[PDB]
Design a protein around this ligand. Structure first.
Ligand SMILES: NC(=O)C1=CN([C@@H]2O[C@H](COP(=O)(O)OP(=O)(O)OC[C@H]3O[C@@H](n4cnc5c(N)ncnc54)[C@H](OP(=O)(O)O)[C@@H]3O)[C@@H](O)[C@H]2O)C=CC1
Ligand SMILES: NC(=O)C1=CN([C@@H]2O[C@H](COP(=O)(O)OP(=O)(O)OC[C@H]3O[C@@H](n4cnc5c(N)ncnc54)[C@H](OP(=O)(O)O)[C@@H]3O)[C@@H](O)[C@H]2O)C=CC1
Lengths: 390, 394
């Protein structure tokens, strides 16, 4: 039972504590550690942090070197977020969070525990096929070693990127941001299981006096103006799927789409508030969308789409899968546990405390309308992922 | 559930029968239809048939033009050290899709094929262990249905059908004999097993209706016993590279089966030209079982270090390893999908067959199954190292 190994992992080592660590900095941030800079959200996080702060962003990246900066640079460039002015703000740090001490020597880790003022832990292995064991190192031990730095030499505030996937599916009443964490058993998939464990670890460090914010994004999607978006995204995969065979599923679940520019603005905004310490926030769209509505938006852009019950739609996918290898790659994702006629289940959240904490900021989630979809679709079209609607 | 789809599908359409078709050739074969000439066994089949008959081999191949299909065929055999340019005039490439009605031919092309072809070796099939039954319904079931339609169109054509030992129930007290009929659908795991089960049900119905058919159930088919030739996309090649790469292997209960392709090829051709074979079913599997630890000993002997762990613990370390390793992750997907009974301590179950009826049929042919030993495994690994699939040892 995987649950037996999760519980054991959710225990934080006794020596991960404030102990005799010097107090957190009270002035402005001078140096920040960000993980996941070569990823989707990390890119907009990195760029947002350069804009809203004057701190040097230390970016932990997997690479063979000065090769880290190029990975970072390329990543931001793929989203239209890079300028040369960013280069001096960014300090790549060669590492691997799936290793002890983030893959640094004892000597390098000690130096880091002295230079870093605050931590934005965004890095994680996101994979919807792999079992728990696959993501144990990066997600569980990665977070454990983050807490180890956060408490080493001098206290460092931790802004932790978690997911709403830590909450049980198949629930009518949205989940409030203050409700405590449930059993490990209520969870499906190795990713959710790993993030569940990680958040347990973080909550333990918080209860032990480390200054921590917990941010649970929902389904994060493209930048609402430029439409910049990760095409390796399952949502993106699924979109091409339906397009290319001209049929979409009916699902009774309410759909959440949170543009990444909101999510990243929100993270920075909430991280800058002393009131956020100890708090959890659901960074999801305040406004939910229905299945058929997104289909309407997509027809309007020009793509034809027959609408089928989810079940009958997976069947057609199965058949088509024997045709395309990309369509098959998507079939593997959808062929697990949620396959019935009303679609897959998915969590529903309240974002009350978030909307409240952000009411005084210029940070508002974009609304999901036909205009946003067109921004997204046009982007995928112009970038070659999709063929232009006839 | 899918067994209900399976059962509906195992029903051979009414019109697929003998009726007014001219009887089968009784003279020498003039033309042969071979499916799957771009695949592994088909390459060896094609070479056996070319060597052992004087017929022209019509190879149904997926391509944009005929000359591309010929190039596809050509390249395949060469990858196995099977090609020879004397074979070119022997081969008649045939553009089509066995997952399409009439194999992807027009009514006119289909009628003309139904006039030319004297016998059918149906070896083409979608072999995929991740996809569901619905993904392989087209090639395996309706593909087989359409071949049976060809075999009964205009004039009768004997069919030699490559099935698989995987249509057989797993975990049974006795090695399944070639004589026992098919069990129900419910006890087959995986879309692949399920589509082949359906396909064999179809072929047996046609048989019952009087179509001359041979049913040939290969076991796990492996590299050529002398050259060591083998297709790397193979799940057994896949698995072996894994264990090598991560320096550990699982200890399993199951008796393993290894059948070199050159024995399968030859036995299929052999049995097919025996008139005693019609209506009969044969199990082309290695008569001698090998054990897990035996196999690990042969590869250590070749030079590869291998720790031995229990399947579940080996499977767990595979999980850990797949974090950074796409191809490791890829392999992990195959094994995680197997039902709990075959993901346990002793590892995956696997079927055990008898090949008595095959031995007698292949009394004196010079055709027998090579043995599994360090020597065979050395031939196998040298090839893969040479092909560059494997890094050499030490
Ligand atoms: N809709 C969404 O995408 C959601 C995201 N989140 C969370 O946001 C965070 C970012 O997700 P997202 O941007 O979408 O995913 P990405 O896969 O695009 O980015 C993952 C980042 O994590 C890095 N990473 C993974 N493993 C390691 C490792 N062992 N060592 C160092 N770096 C590593 C990756 O570096 P590398 O390039 O080397 O792989 C990459 O930069 C994650 O924690 C995710 O769980 C939460 C809810 C929803
Ligand atoms: N260990 C083994 O290999 C065993 C194999 N078998 C059976 O042997 C036969 C072939 O096995 P194997 O050689 O290993 O597999 P391969 O995948 O190597 O060969 C598959 C062959 O089938 C062709 N094929 C698949 N789909 C189509 C299609 N829609 N139209 C035309 N051709 C198609 C392929 O052509 P293309 O290249 O264009 O895809 C290819 O020529 C199968 O019937 C299999 O069930 C049975 C037991 C064991």
């Amino acid at each position: 039972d995987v649950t037996v190994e999760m519980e054991a992992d959710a225990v934080l080592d006794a020596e991960i504590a404030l102990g005799k660590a010097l107090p957190p900095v009270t002035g402005a941030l001078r140096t920040i550690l960000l993980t996941g800079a070569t990823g989707f959200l990390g890119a907009f996080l990195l760029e947002e942090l350069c804009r809203r702060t004057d701190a040097r962003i230390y970016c932990l990246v997997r690479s063979k070197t000065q090769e880290g900066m190029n990975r970072i640079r390329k990543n931001l460039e793929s989203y239209s977020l890079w300028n040369e002015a960013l280069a001096p703000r960014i300090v790549p740090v060669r590492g691997d969070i799936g290793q002890p001490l983030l893959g640094l020597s004892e000597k390098e880790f000690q130096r880091l525990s002295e230079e870093i003022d605050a931590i934005y832990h965004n890095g994680a292995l996101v994979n919807f096929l792999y079992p728990y064991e696959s993501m144990r190192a990066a997600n569980v031990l990665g977070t454990r070693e983050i807490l180890r730095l956060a408490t080493r030499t001098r206290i460092k505030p931790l802004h932790y990127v978690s997911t709403v996937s830590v909450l049980p599916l198949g629930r009518k009443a949205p989940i409030r941001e203050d409700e405590p964490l449930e059993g490990p058993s209520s969870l499906v998939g190795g990713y959710a299981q790993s993030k569940w464990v990680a958040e347990k670890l973080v909550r333990e460090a918080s209860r032990r006096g480390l200054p921590v914010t917990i941010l649970r994004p929902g389904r994060v999607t493209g930048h609402s103006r430029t439409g910049a978006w990760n095409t390796d995204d399952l949502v993106c995969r699924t979109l091409k799927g339906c397009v290319r065979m001209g049929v979409a599923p009916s699902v009774d679940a309410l759909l959440d789409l949170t543009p990444v520019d909101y999510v990243s603005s929100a993270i920075v905004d909430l991280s800058m508030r002393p009131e956020s310490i100890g708090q959890t926030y659901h960074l999801v769209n305040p406004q939910f969308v229905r299945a058929d509505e997104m289909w309407n938006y997509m027809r309007a852009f020009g793509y034809g789409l027959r609408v089928l019950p989810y079940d009958q739609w997976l069947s057609e996918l199965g058949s088509a899968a024997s045709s395309d290898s990309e369509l098959g790659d998507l079939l593997m994702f959808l062929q697990q546990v949620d396959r019935s006629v009303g679609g897959p289940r998915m969590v529903v959240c309240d974002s009350g405390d978030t909307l409240k904490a952000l009411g005084g900021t210029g940070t508002s989630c974009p609304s999901v309308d036909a205009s946003l979809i067109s921004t997204y679709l046009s982007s995928l079209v112009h970038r070659g992922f999709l063929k232009a609607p006839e």
